[PDB]
Design a protein around this ligand. Structure first.
Ligand SMILES: *[C@@H]1O[C@H](CO)[C@@H](O[C@@H]2O[C@H](CO)[C@@H](O)[C@H](O)[C@H]2NC(C)=O)[C@H](O)[C@H]1NC(C)=O
Ligand SMILES: *[C@@H]1O[C@H](CO)[C@@H](O)[C@H](O)[C@H]1NC(C)=O
Ligand SMILES: *[C@@H]1O[C@H](CO)[C@@H](O)[C@H](O)[C@H]1NC(C)=O
Ligand SMILES: *[C@@H]1O[C@H](CO)[C@@H](O)[C@H](O)[C@H]1NC(C)=O
Ligand SMILES: *[C@@H]1O[C@H](CO)[C@@H](O)[C@H](O)[C@H]1NC(C)=O
Ligand SMILES: *[C@@H]1O[C@H](CO)[C@@H](O)[C@H](O)[C@H]1NC(C)=O
Ligand SMILES: *[C@@H]1O[C@H](CO)[C@@H](O)[C@H](O)[C@H]1NC(C)=O
Ligand SMILES: *[C@@H]1O[C@H](CO)[C@@H](O)[C@H](O)[C@H]1NC(C)=O
Ligand SMILES: *[C@@H]1O[C@H](CO)[C@@H](O)[C@H](O)[C@H]1NC(C)=O
Ligand SMILES: *[C@@H]1O[C@H](CO)[C@@H](O)[C@H](O)[C@H]1NC(C)=O
Lengths: 541, 399, 186
């Protein structure tokens, strides 16, 4: 059983005539072709010719009752050709490949040079192939042509015994997509924290709190001014379609090569003595050299760091302490000297230094994915609200699919989400307006196929389990919706169990009938208080 | 009259493995394709369980060829089955006790499939078995139904436990009163005690607990950054979203396999219980069993079935001896140097002289050559006693 | 189980030789561990399902053994344990992976309606049948066995006396032929 681009069974292939000029043809993902026309132009390039001696092909060059069946397709540029000499009738005739062109042409056209011919296109269609003992495809099944073929594929057989088989799962597909972001317009002040004049020094890193705005992180990873722009727990690409409660831009300036210390779980100077990120960090780190202005001649010692600290740090805590650091047991009490150190020192930043030495501006954007109302959103357009229909909704950046309805749930002003046993959002609150709407997974169920033996027949009934007939000759059970069975009012021995007392059988102009099964022939024993039935004979069973 | 409650079936569930694991995400579905055919195995197993449940119900209840009906006039020798016969007033033709029993047993790819036999169909089957037992006895289970008066049937059964049929015919009113009182006491003992149907409720609760655990297991990260596939996909790119989704797939697949294994084991237990219930319907309802404690406590007379949610309830009617009396007894009797043994019963004496009685009900009778048989002389039996044996021809022999 | 070896389980290939002939030890180790994880899960699943099926088969075999002992090596009174009907005898036949029991049963047939009585009044004495039931074809009363109509004259040999005929419900009046008095020519 393969999953390739095939010509689906019993499809509408165009029939063209050339003599009363070859007409224009498209070329989708693939093409079929037949004839009673030697050559096939392509393009949007490739050319084929039969000089009656050897096939000639050019773009590159290559040389090598006639139902000449052909198939052409293109995948990542590779152009495959298959064919067969069949002496559109019945039967199967699989097409061995003859050639592949491994170059790659973007094809969106098709032509023909030189009668009458046929053309059929290909779709990705799972097929069940029957390799015979001699190794040749003698038969096949299109798994999506009809319910019987789907049953055959599910069973992986070409013969199906009488019974009921669940072959796949039905579920309604979404009609349209929905986006509901808050009505915010002011842009987030990213240029300020990024193009500020002086970033606070690494020991007093300054944390701006961006909130209630529309951030366009597209321009951040677009600009090439950043040596490092790397995110954790998130991808920059998808930052424009997420809504965060608020952002924290912790800015400072650090040594050139101590940059990779700004990352979760990192150990070293700045991690454990000045600034560490939590191991559950969700956000981006931006670092870029500041040699242009920061460093000057003579030693720019106005940017400090904290060298000694008695112990390590928490994630996200700042130390503005300038108090001396005591290494020994002798108290210092504010005087330097023997074992009395000053824990703050100054970066030596001159443009005469090395390349891995210049000052690097570092801004760490930390995001919090809380359930509070989202204030920092992305540059994404809100749409209208659709109820009573399976839709692809997006509320405040969380995707999903289902039907939205008016809910009577009493959200309290601080709640924005209902939640299920499985941590599934059961209900939500619009950001644009303020109303509570319930989310429900739009209908799904199993699809069972009632078929008698393929020997008996080839028509089937279809059961859509635990669904109404309104979201799918037709007959509603307590087992689901039957399609293809005649509901009689009679009652017979159960043949194929549907459920809820309903059975299905093949009989009468034979058809599939659905009936309520009978438990047996009624009987009333001739009971009286002075009557007895006695046997006069026996059978040996 | 004693009850025996047996579970027969359990709830038929289906789980779309690919929808429990990968709700609607196609990234996750393509990533789960590379685990092979685990989903197919799981669905096959659950479908087998579901089929087995309907099979169990058939085996238990579908034991009558025809649907027997009780006559309009209920003249059963004083016996009153009104509490176990169907009530035509109710929409569902259920008995009073069946109604009483049915009142005491109370997405994410998960569906519940309806049973093939409705509660109405099962109640019809039970009513048919009841009517057959009432009108025809054990004949309808061994061939054609042969009508017989109920008192004569109960005499048959009394002989089946070793008690002569005169004993029933001479105490018919008392026996009927005892039976009707015991049925009433069943009604009351059931309506009052809340945990009388603990077994069925336990089956129900086990299934619900298992499903709830399965469902809650989707809130677990399994090592990933989140338990929600959409959040992972709306936040991460393909290469690392793939890692997180693989963690989630591993976890949810393990959870589902645990569920299915536990359900297979429970279904085996339930199949054993249903086979036992079927054997009891055949041996206790469609017949009179000599097996001790198999159809209630005591000497089994007759059992009556009643449907229950996911199960069956047997009302076993047994004969329990009572009001014992002490006697002195002997294995044999010496008379004219011949040893007499009882053909059917024992020799007892009230103290003065000797009688022969049946073993299960004191009914003393004169020791004759009709109640006894001779074998040997009275010098080899240990415990043999002297007493006259009345030949019922000599005083009759006036001619 | 065999098809589960064509699955990657996350690896670059399902074939160990391909992974070993293409990658060095440190990363081939990663891929092989993925394959091991998956194939081991598959094998555990197979073994568990086989244990469960073996339990089912063991139960069926114990049932078949009980039926060989009770239906074949004896005659069973258990209803429907050895076929439908009153069991006479069973015969075993081997079959692939199993056994086939041919249950020979007696099924009554050709029923006839009769009118019956629990007892009979004669000389102020209530007679009950020792083995069988009292029936009447409309004119005379007879005593027959319960499973085959074979009517016989009601004598003091076919019946036993217990009490008088004023306590049995449904007792009828009919003569009981003592087979001594017309014989009592002496
Ligand atoms: C008991 O039943 C058997 C059938 O099982 C009867 O036998 C048949 O009798 C008819 C005519 O008497 C013949 O034509 C058939 O060939 C017989 N069949 C067999 C299998 O023997 C038998 O007559 C019945 N006995 C009574 C008394 O009714
Ligand atoms: C049978 O019992 C019911 C009580 O369950 C009573 O109402 C009814 O009258 C009784 N029938 C007879 C004939 O005694
Ligand atoms: C029989 O006699 C014994 C004497 O020890 C006594 O304990 C017992 O209760 C008596 N049984 C009955 C039924 O009277
Ligand atoms: C024993 O029974 C006989 C007859 O039933 C009676 O005459 C006698 O008085 C009884 N004796 C005792 C001790 O019960
Ligand atoms: C019963 O036991 C008594 C003494 O316990 C003894 O005298 C008598 O012979 C015994 N009878 C039998 C039949 O064992
Ligand atoms: C029974 O009678 C015989 C003779 O009639 C006598 O030998 C024997 O001892 C008697 N048994 C008893 C227990 O009296
Ligand atoms: C016995 O009589 C009843 C009368 O209702 C009749 O329906 C039944 O068929 C009779 N039985 C036989 C075996 O003829
Ligand atoms: C009943 O049977 C007896 C003897 O077999 C016979 O004389 C009589 O005529 C029969 N009566 C009927 C109504 O068949
Ligand atoms: C049988 O019922 C009739 C009325 O249907 C009645 O006259 C007769 O006494 C009853 N006999 C018995 C034994 O129940
Ligand atoms: C039976 O006979 C007795 C007297 O011989 C009589 O009193 C009684 O009424 C009779 N029974 C019937 C049902 O005729």
């Amino acid at each position: 059983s393969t999953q390739d681009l095939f010509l689906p069974f019993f499809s509408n292939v165009t029939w063209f005539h050339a003599i009363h000029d070859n007409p224009v043809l498209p070329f989708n993902d693939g093409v079929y072709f037949a004839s009673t026309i030697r050559g096939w132009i392509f393009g949007t390039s490739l050319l084929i010719v039969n000089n009656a001696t050897n096939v000639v092909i050019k773009v590159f060059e290559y040389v090598s009752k006639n139902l000449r069946e052909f198939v052409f397709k293109n995948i990542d540029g590779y152009f495959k050709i298959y064919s067969k000499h069949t002496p559109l009738p019945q039967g199967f005739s699989a097409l061995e490949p003859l050639v592949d062109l491994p170059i790659g042409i973007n094809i969106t056209r098709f032509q023909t040079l030189l009668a009458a011919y046929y053309v059929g296109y290909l779709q990705p269609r799972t097929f069940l192939l029957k390799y015979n003992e001699n190794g040749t495809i003698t038969d096949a099944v299109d798994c999506a042509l009809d319910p019987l073929s789907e049953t055959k594929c599910t069973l992986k057989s070409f013969t199906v015994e009488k019974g009921i088989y669940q072959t796949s799962n039905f579920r309604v597909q979404p009609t349209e997509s929905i986006v509901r972001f808050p009505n915010i317009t002011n842009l987030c002040p990213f240029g300020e924290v990024f193009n500020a004049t002086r970033f606070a020094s690494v020991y007093a890193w300054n944390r701006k709190r961006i909130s209630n705005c529309v951030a366009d992180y597209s321009v951040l990873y677009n600009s090439a001014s950043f040596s490092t722009f790397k995110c954790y727990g998130v991808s920059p690409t998808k930052l424009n379609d997420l809504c965060f409660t608020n952002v924290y831009a912790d800015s400072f300036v650090i040594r050139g090569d101590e940059v990779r210390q700004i990352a979760p779980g990192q150990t070293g100077k700045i991690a454990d003595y000045n600034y560490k990120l939590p191991d559950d960090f969700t956000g981006c780190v931006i670092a870029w050299n500041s040699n242009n202005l920061d460093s000057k001649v003579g030693g720019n010692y106005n940017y400090l760091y904290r060298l000694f600290r008695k112990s390590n740090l928490k994630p996200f805590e700042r130390d503005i302490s300038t108090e001396i650091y005591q290494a020994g047991s002798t108290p210092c009490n504010g005087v330097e000297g023997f074992n009395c150190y000053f824990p703050l020192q100054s970066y030596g930043f001159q443009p005469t230094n090395g390349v891995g030495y210049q000052p690097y501006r570092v801004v760490v954007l930390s995001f919090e994915l809380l359930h509070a109302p989202a204030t920092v959103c992305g540059p994404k357009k809100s749409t209208n609200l659709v109820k009573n229909k399976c839709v692809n909704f997006n509320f405040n950046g969380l995707t999903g699919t289902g039907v939205l309805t008016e809910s009577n749930k009493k959200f309290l002003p601080f709640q924005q989400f209902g939640r299920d046993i499985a941590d599934t959002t059961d209900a939500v609150r619009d950001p644009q307006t303020l109303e509570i709407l319930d989310i429900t997974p739009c209908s799904f169920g199993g699809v069972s196929v009632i078929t008698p033996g393929t020997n008996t027949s080839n028509q089937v009934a279809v059961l859509y389990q635990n669904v109404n007939c309104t979201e799918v000759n037709v007959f509603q059970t307590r087992a689901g919706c039957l399609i293809g069975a005649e509901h009689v009012n009679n009652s017979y021995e159960c043949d194929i169990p549907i459920g809820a007392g309903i059975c299905a059988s093949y009989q009468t102009s034979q058809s599939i009938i659905a009936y309520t099964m009978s438990l047996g022939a009624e009987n009333s024993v001739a009971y009286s208080n002075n009557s007895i039935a006695i046997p006069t004979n026996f059978t040996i069973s | 009259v004693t009850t025996e409650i047996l579970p027969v079936s359990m709830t038929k569930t289906s789980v779309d493995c690919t929808m429990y694991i990968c709700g609607d995400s196609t990234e996750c579905s393509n990533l789960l394709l590379q685990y092979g055919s685990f989903c197919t195995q799981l669905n096959r197993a659950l479908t087998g369980i579901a089929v087995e449940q309907d099979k169990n119900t058939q085996e238990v209840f579908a034991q009558v060829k025809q649907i027997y009906k009780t006559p309009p006039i209920k003249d059963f020798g004083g016996f009153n089955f009104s509490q176990i016969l169907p009530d035509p007033s109710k929409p569902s033709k259920r008995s009073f006790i069946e109604d009483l029993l049915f009142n005491k047993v109370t997405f994410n790819g998960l569906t519940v499939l309806p049973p093939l036999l409705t509660d109405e169909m099962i109640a019809q089957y039970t009513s048919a078995l009841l009517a057959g037992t009432i009108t025809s006895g054990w004949t309808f289970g061994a061939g054609p139904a042969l009508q017989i008066p109920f008192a004569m049937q109960m005499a048959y059964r009394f002989n089946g436990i070793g008690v002569t049929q005169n004993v029933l015919y001479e105490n018919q009113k008392l026996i009927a009163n005892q039976f009707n009182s015991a049925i009433g006491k069943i009604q009351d003992s059931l309506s009052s005690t809340p945990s009388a149907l603990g077994k069925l409720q336990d089956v129900v609760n086990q299934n619900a607990q298992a499903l709830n655990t399965l469902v809650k297991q989707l809130s677990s990260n399994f090592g990933a950054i989140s338990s929600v596939l959409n959040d992972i996909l709306s936040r991460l790119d393909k290469p690392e979203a793939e890692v997180q989704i693989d963690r989630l797939i591993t976890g949810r697949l393990q959870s589902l396999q645990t569920y299915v294994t536990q359900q297979l084991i429970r279904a085996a237990e339930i199949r054993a219980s249903a086979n036992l219930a079927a054997t009891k319907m055949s041996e206790c309802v469609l017949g009179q069993s000599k097996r001790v404690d198999f159809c209630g406590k005591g000497y089994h007379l007759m059992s009556f079935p009643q449907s229950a949610p996911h199960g069956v309830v047997f009302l076993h009617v047994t004969y329990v001896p009572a009001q014992e009396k002490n006697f002195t007894t002997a294995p044999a009797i010496c008379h004219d140097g011949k040893a007499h043994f009882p053909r059917e019963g024992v020799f007892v004496s009230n103290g003065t002289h000797w009688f022969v009685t049946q073993r299960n009900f004191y009914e003393p009778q004169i020791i004759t050559t009709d109640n006894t048989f001779v074998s040997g002389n009275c010098d080899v039996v240990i415990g043999i006693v002297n007493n006259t044996v009345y030949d019922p021809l000599q005083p009759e022999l006036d001619s």
